[PDB]
Amino acid sequence: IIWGAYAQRNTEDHPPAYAPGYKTSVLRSPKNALISIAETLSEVTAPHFSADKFGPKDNDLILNYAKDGLPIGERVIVHGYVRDQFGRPVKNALVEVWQANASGRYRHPNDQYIGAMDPNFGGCGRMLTDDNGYYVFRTIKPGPYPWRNRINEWRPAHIHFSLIADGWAQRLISQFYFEGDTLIDSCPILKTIPSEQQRRALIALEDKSNFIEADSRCYRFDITLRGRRATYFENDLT
């Protein structure tokens, strides 16, 4: 199998750069259209990170920052599969996540919300997908976060995530939400995505059979990255 380029990003499946309802985008969006290029080795390659350098609790947000006790909040496991658009598993991709604590408070110098800080919660984790493209992490469900877009704007509970996989063209940062949160329908950030079906692709689903009795709930969330086409005739990449 000789691989060719990644399939084109479908711009209609993503938010536009200029989205006036999300105010900060007004001055941080290019006026010019993006220039599309044909891919080269630069775009189809990406770094490799070694499993040996990850700590044992890197994917356990409940314990990786606990000092005197456990963090306060809802114990949840999040798991799922990372695949490319043609359904193939994405192996050994680096997945990084970050989030607020149970109060909706971020451990960040620029966050002054009055919701309480939790001395035993950090809010970041990471992991590598396995050979089936599977990932699993455990955390405290984050609380919704008020912010200043319009004065009374509130983000639904959410976890930020980032993927570095096989090709630089697959690089992606997004956020996922939790089934049933009523704030999902009001969020201006989620509303930058033009289509309803794509907005739903960011909602993690309650996975009842995988809850752990007297311990933790569980949410299932799969992620799809761009996929490479195979070449059977001329190989122009090089």
Binding site: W3, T11, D13, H14, P15, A17, S25, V26, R28, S29, P30, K31, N32, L34, I35, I37, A38, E39, T40, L41, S42, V44, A46, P47, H48, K53, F54, G55, Y65, Q85, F86, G87, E96, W98, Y106, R107, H108, N110, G122, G123, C124, G125, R126, H160, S162, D166, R171, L172, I173, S174, Q175, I189, L190, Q198, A201, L202, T224, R226, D236, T238
Partner: protein, 202 residues
């Protein structure tokens, strides 16, 4: 067939998860950073630095930047590189940094990349691929950094020549300086407005 997961902004606290030390969080033993040079890395050491500006001309003090590039011989440290050449074994080819919260300056310590094959037998000029994430940016913005001392190679570069507005090509050329015997390339990014930097859909 499946659709790609849609992008969403990184938000203003993107450092909690991608540069926890910048947010004052010590959870990991090994941290990812902006230094791509290991002691045995081959090549010419350079510093790449600059600021990112919004449409009012003000620097973004919450931007996160990553770069991806080839080693000194133009080989990527990736299993997808098909050149059949051995890559420098002490080179990750990638790094991440954040702008300083007060000034907006960002920097990377790296090596000047060698030329990489382009499509159909062409040769690309030396370049670093760069992506920008921040509050207000809905999808990471991709650009490339070329070097002003590689005039000949830039003139023949397939990607630069594919930008039909010739005046905009210059926004992708970093300026070489020499601070204390250290070679520095200054690359400022203007997200919007006059002299707006070219961004690519890759």
């Amino acid at each position: 067939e499946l659709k790609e997961t849609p992008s969403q902004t990184g938000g203003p606290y993107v450092h909690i998860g991608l540069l926890p030390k910048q947010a004052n969080i010590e959870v990991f033993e090994h941290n990812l950073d902006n230094n791509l040079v290991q002691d045995n890395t081959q090549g010419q050491r350079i510093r790449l630095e600059g600021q990112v500006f919004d449409g009012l001309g003000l620097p973004l003090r919450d931007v996160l930047i990553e770069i991806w590039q080839a080693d000194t011989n133009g080989v990527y440290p990736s299993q997808a590189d098909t050149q059949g050449k051995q890559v420098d074994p002490n080179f990750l080819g990638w790094g991440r940094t954040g702008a300083d919260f007060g000034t907006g300056f960002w920097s990377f310590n790296t090596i000047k990349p060698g030329a990489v094959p382009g499509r159909k037998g062409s040769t690309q000029a030396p370049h670093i691929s760069l992506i920008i994430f921040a509050r207000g940016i809905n999808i990471g913005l991709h650009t490339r950094v070329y070097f002003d001392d590689e005039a000949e190679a830039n003139a023949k570069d397939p990607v630069l020549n594919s930008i039909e507005w010739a005046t905009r090509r210059q926004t992708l050329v970093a300026k070489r300086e020499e601070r204390d015997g250290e070679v520095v390339y200054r690359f400022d990014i203007r997200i919007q407005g006059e002299n707006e930097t070219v961004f690519f859909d890759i």
